[PDB]
């Protein structure tokens, strides 16, 4: 098996968050862990400024900042889920930012079952040690000597086997842990000192205490309080020596508090977040003492308001809180001293997309044909949603004029008072036209000073309240009031101008090979200098960059013949830098531009190639050449603003926006047909807009947010579970569940209680529903509620037998507390007609209906340990045809032709065939290796894909004996690092090295793709990986091969049959010399030594598949 796996959407769920001074001594930073990704921000009064985002070869399990004695700057400790430990430092060497690994090592033990309650990692306030709870009964200590670069550790026996939480205390002479543990006698809090000298615990400073039965979190309180707060379900207690204070506030009893964060450095106030998204303030009241110590007088809890359900909370000063969510969108909120109308102190400032968990999804061509969109069931509880995801950036067209032959567009302010454009100047072969803008009206008009009988190459507002028009014949300077020609420049023999560039006070024009530099003065075009280039000029730019006061010391130029992009000094025209771009196709557009504070040269060729380089605006040096391909026609580049950010629109057959993300250039398709020319337009009637032209038409519209994927959110206010599309009804079916309390009563309104119409089947509880949702408005048209204690598990939309209706079919389970698994459930066939669901037929079965699939006009269903095929009879009932029994728990089905792939709870996958001339199933083959499955997919007749609970993928094949024949072989293995809930065939790209397309959705909201490769392609890419791994410096010095090794509690093996597309794609981001190392000696097709250029082309083809 040869497979390739790549990220289409990175994990969005927030697994943890910390604050401190990491980037510099005086920066306040927010660090966010999104599984495999670490995001670093500087906190401002403006908000969060992104400075650096890195990938780890690992799932981040522990992330803590700490400050070694007498240092100005925090270091970062990370532990991965595979027990990779590192200490990281942030270093900025001028422009370049580097994460350096100061220490690393793997801290796994040989014997050890991972603690069921997870990895805990803590660091003592005096930075003497890191403490890790990895396994029950052991506490691992890493001394923080500067010498301990390998992070060598020792284990201490911990008598208490079941630790709930642990922290290091402040204000202690020896490092001291405080922890809650559980035994038969209940829950207790205890302390121990940790002796480095003895490598053992010593007696803690205070005696143990019994605590609440559901005590779950330990907070170490800084000086001057010291001590610990213990949070439980109905109590909050403070402990410190012969000091004990407890409160039992009813207000917290409704929902478990699951996260905390310190507001005040001295511990006077904490935030607390619960499972329903309530946000509390915990206040510690001080009492003075004669000896000048400070003790705790009392504790209070106050309800502040509501946030997203928080996985973590981080106070960012000035009343600002970052709410990191796993189950909904993350937020920035503000806390105010005074409450609002409805009584909340919490006001939301910003919302960040989280797709996670993705519990189901499907692919549908909603709008066009051939343009797939992903529709997910996302989130949980009050955060549950549908998310609709599609590639590319949209334009909202607001005007359309038929007007062929446009050769350029320029906006103009004809009134020197008003700030908005009021004029659009259009060029045509040998002619110019001026459109005036009065509101939404676009009237043809003249404009005194400008000529209409020459083609315009540039026109604009310029210095000293003047306008400029540059044509093939001359440069014309025009006064604003009144409009009159005040100056006109011509070449000495009045030869044609061939190329024009202009800013507010400078002009460079070309005449064949000649260049002329003019300055714009009051009533004067002043000729400053001229030169003769070695070849004919193709293109020019003099865009001023940086702190430049609108003046460029640089001229960028592209030439014929040598195909060079050059940087020249003005006024002398001295050559500062030359780059030969190769080939025999001339540069067509060149642009100096700034993205996220870094300066670049862009240069586009007529064949669709785009080169880009770092530009030093001081020396004129170009560096770090990169090349993408943006189409096959000449590309024309032009800056525009939207949402207070400068970007570049690339006009071609493939219109593109160029922008920056994490200080790397990014290229995103615009969803339009061919655009030939554009300009920004910001007029009264068309504010913050774009004017667009093709061969026949002028358009004016606004642009969506600049990003790779557009996401629409449909709030449900309850948990979505499964989704299916029903084309004939133009709706989705969505299974959903809401929580109600002890009959039962609801916590808030939600999709299933707010449908247009409703039907019903004739502690906290789940109430399950089938929602019918309109595909255009996403309005809830109908909700059908299932029986009390009925859980809806599976859903399909299909036709059966000879019946022409399409039905929604739901499989359920009746859930009773004492049952190990369900012994009762239903299959229900519904028809959606006239705005309601009618129940057409039912069938009681003796188990949970985990999975259903349409199979050759029949209904395949898995019921507990049985796989069953039903026929749909002429009297509209389901009738069993055949059964398969050899499963533990058949959770997952997929089919292809007569083949059925079965995913088991614990015995991996199994391949059935229906035998149409015997009316029964045959077991073809089974994977005899145990695996705890989460999802399955058929890649093709011979290849079966599985995902399992320890975040691995594998691929099974038949072994091309007869006892031998029924053994599936695991021929592919890969540690993905995500939990796959759903696989589905399809693509987000409009319909090569790869064949097939399978998308997957995950708990962290990551979306991935799996596709197939030939042996040949695999071998090349495998070889590339090995070379890439030798040159790339990895954060924490984790080996890529270690990261991607298949890993469960049973077995660890190198990955095989799987290319890591994220790694391959990173090839485009290394330095050109590194690309040479990577390239040196490797075959490529009959055969030859491959070049860096060859590989850039290949990797580009591979980015196109998502
Ligand atoms: C195992 O524990 C440790 C603790 C601290 C360091 C360390 N401190 C530093 C300082 C000096 C220059 N940069 C910050 N660089 O590494 C290394 C390993």
From Swiss-Prot:
Pathway involvement of the protein, from the record: Protein modification; protein ubiquitination
Residues with the N6-acetyllysine modification: 1037
Subcellular location, record wording: Cytoplasm; Nucleus
UniProt superkingdom: Eukaryota
InterPro entries, per database record: Beta-prop_RSE1/DDB1/CPSF1_1st, Cleavage/polyA-sp_fac_asu_C, RSE1/DDB1/CFT1/CPSF1, WD40/YVTN_repeat-like_dom_sf, WD40_repeat_dom_sf
Keywords associated with the record: Acetylation, Biological rhythms, Cytoplasm, Disease variant, DNA damage, DNA repair, DNA-binding, Host-virus interaction, Intellectual disability, Isopeptide bond, Nucleus, Phosphoprotein, Repeat, Ubl conjugation, Ubl conjugation pathway
Region (Interaction with CDT1 and CUL4A) residue spans: 763-1106
Region named WD repeat beta-propeller C: 708-1013
GO MF entry, a single one: protein-macromolecule adaptor activity
Region named Interaction with CDT1: 1-762
Pfam families per UniProt: Beta-prop_RSE1_1st (PF10433), Beta-prop_RSE1_2nd (PF23726), CPSF_A (PF03178)
Region of interest called WD repeat beta-propeller A, as start-end residue ranges on this chain: 12-355
Function recorded in the entry: Protein, which is both involved in DNA repair and protein ubiquitination, as part of the UV-DDB complex and DCX (DDB1-CUL4-X-box) complexes, respectively. Core component of the UV-DDB complex (UV-damaged DNA-binding protein complex), a complex that recognizes UV-induced DNA damage and recruit proteins of the nucleotide excision repair pathway (the NER pathway) to initiate DNA repair. The UV-DDB complex preferentially binds to cyclobutane pyrimidine dimers (CPD), 6-4 photoproducts (6-4 PP), apurinic sites and short mismatches.
Membership in a protein family: Belongs to the DDB1 family.
Protein name (record): DNA damage-binding protein 1
Gene name of the record: DDB1
